[PDB]
């Protein structure tokens, strides 16, 4: 890595002495050392990079967003100086984008990634990084165009293949996504050994009837991406008790279960009133999990936040639930009504995290035609009764009754999570 331009080679001793202080952890000393070099040599790219790296380390030491924003600006200043070596220009801008994504400046990161692709049009990995920037903001269309542009030039790039297959699979192009996902993982290129790609390759194969799907779930399990072949959530706290079905006593949330079962008719009645008078509050499930039929949900809580307008449609239910922070505070779960009509089948699927358990309170359950499978066991609901399963295990639902099914879904923190973990875990 050639980081010194012609002038920087003539002050190589001073630059190495300052950088050695930063590698030793003397951050304040290194900050002032590079500050002096930037003063004496205001055009030095290596001195400016040292200033930025020291601000980067100082932000880590302080866990300070404001200090990191200063580092992000100094990484920019490096790129603005004359005669910046190509290796240094790329390092400074790549770190800038990486730190912008850390702060959540996803739009700003995108501008930095685009500039990197403009400066180095032959670096295919920078285009792949740009595609990740689009994926992080939720712009799958522009991400798809980026990887198609990469695959036009380098068809064998494994990173581009998995991410293209991921985009195709997200767009419900199930059959088309399989060879891109498969060949991408099989390439072994950096960035392809990711749990997201084993998860969706196996799921795509499941939807098309490919029996080789669980071979890829076992390979993902062997490489540390899945807790097991059945439990394939990707946002896990390791060690939590893993079983598909739970009894109320096993969860310890016996007071919540008692309240739901004592008061279930007021929950049902408000759900029915929304069906009859405000049906638009039920939104069709839009995560591509419905194989066929009609499936909608009316969400009262998500990420531990109460939807005020929705609770105006179920005020008594929300009042009852407010007494139970184990569900209203579950920032990795929801509280929602769920309606499924006859002819509905939900693809086998897995929730995102092992940090929640999912309760179903039966509200309107037809006598025949409705069942839910979790892992190897299929069960039925009962009106006014709570069943509890871990939806990080593969589960599946059928609705073949002659009228509608209505349930109340109440997520709780996994009981083995400490109060510390419940406060700090990022919301999902």
């Amino acid at each position: 890595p050639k980081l010194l331009n012609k002038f920087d080679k003539t002050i190589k001793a001073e630059l190495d002495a300052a950088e050695k202080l930063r590698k030793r952890g003397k951050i304040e000393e290194a900050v002032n050392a590079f500050k002096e070099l930037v003063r004496k040599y205001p055009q030095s790219p290596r001195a400016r990079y040292g200033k930025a790296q020291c601000e980067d380390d100082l932000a880590e030491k302080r866990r300070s967003n404001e200090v990191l924003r200063g580092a992000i600006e100094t990484y920019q200043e490096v790129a603005s100086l004359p005669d910046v070596p190509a290796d240094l220009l790329k390092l400074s801008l790549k770190r800038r984008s990486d730190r912008q994504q850390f702060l959540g400046h996803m739009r700003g990161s995108l501008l930095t990634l685009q500039r990197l692709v403009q400066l180095f049009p032959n670096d295919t990995s920078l285009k792949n990084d740009l595609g990740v920037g689009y994926l992080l903001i939720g712009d799958n269309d522009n991400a798809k165009k980026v990887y198609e542009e990469v695959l036009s030039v380098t068809p064998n790039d494994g990173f581009a293949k998995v991410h293209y297959g991921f985009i195709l699979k997200a767009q419900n192009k199930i059959a088309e996504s399989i060879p891109y996902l498969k060949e991408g993982i099989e390439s072994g290129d950096p960035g392809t050994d990711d749990g997201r790609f084993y998860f969706h390759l196996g799921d795509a194969m499941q939807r098309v009837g490919n029996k080789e799907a669980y071979k890829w779930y076992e390979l993902g399990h062997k490489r540390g991406h899945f807790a097991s072949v059945w439990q394939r959530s990707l946002y896990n706290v390791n060690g939590l008790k893993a079983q598909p079905w739970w009894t109320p006593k096993e969860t310890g949330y016996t007071e919540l279960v008692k309240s739901l079962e004592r008061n279930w008719k007021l929950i049902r009645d408000e759900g029915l009133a929304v069906m009859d008078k405000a049906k638009g509050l039920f939104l069709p499930e839009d995560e591509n999990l419905r194989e066929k039929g009609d499936w909608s949900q009316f969400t009262l809580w998500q990420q531990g936040r109460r939807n005020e307008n929705a609770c105006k449609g179920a005020p008594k239910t929300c009042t009852l639930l407010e007494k139970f922070p184990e569900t209203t505070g579950c920032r990795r779960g929801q509280i929602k009504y769920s309606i499924m009509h006859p002819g509905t089948h939900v693809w086998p699927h897995t929730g995102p995290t092992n940090c929640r358990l999912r309760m179903h309170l039966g509200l309107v359950i037809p006598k025949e035609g409705c069942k839910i499978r979790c892992a190897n066991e299929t069960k039925t609901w009962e009106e006014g009764k709570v069943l509890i399963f871990d939806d990080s295990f593969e589960h599946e639902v059928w609705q073949d009754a002659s009228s509608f099914q209505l349930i109340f879904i109440v997520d709780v923190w996994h009981p083995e999570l400490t109060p510390q973990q419940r406060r700090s875990l990022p919301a999902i």
Partner: peptide, 18 residues
């Protein structure tokens, strides 16, 4: 997009700095 019922999104969390 949010990962409520599944894992369809590229990332399911939202980074907001330290």
């Amino acid at each position: 997009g949010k990962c409520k019922d599944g894992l369809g999104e590229y990332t399911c969390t939202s980074l907001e700095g330290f």
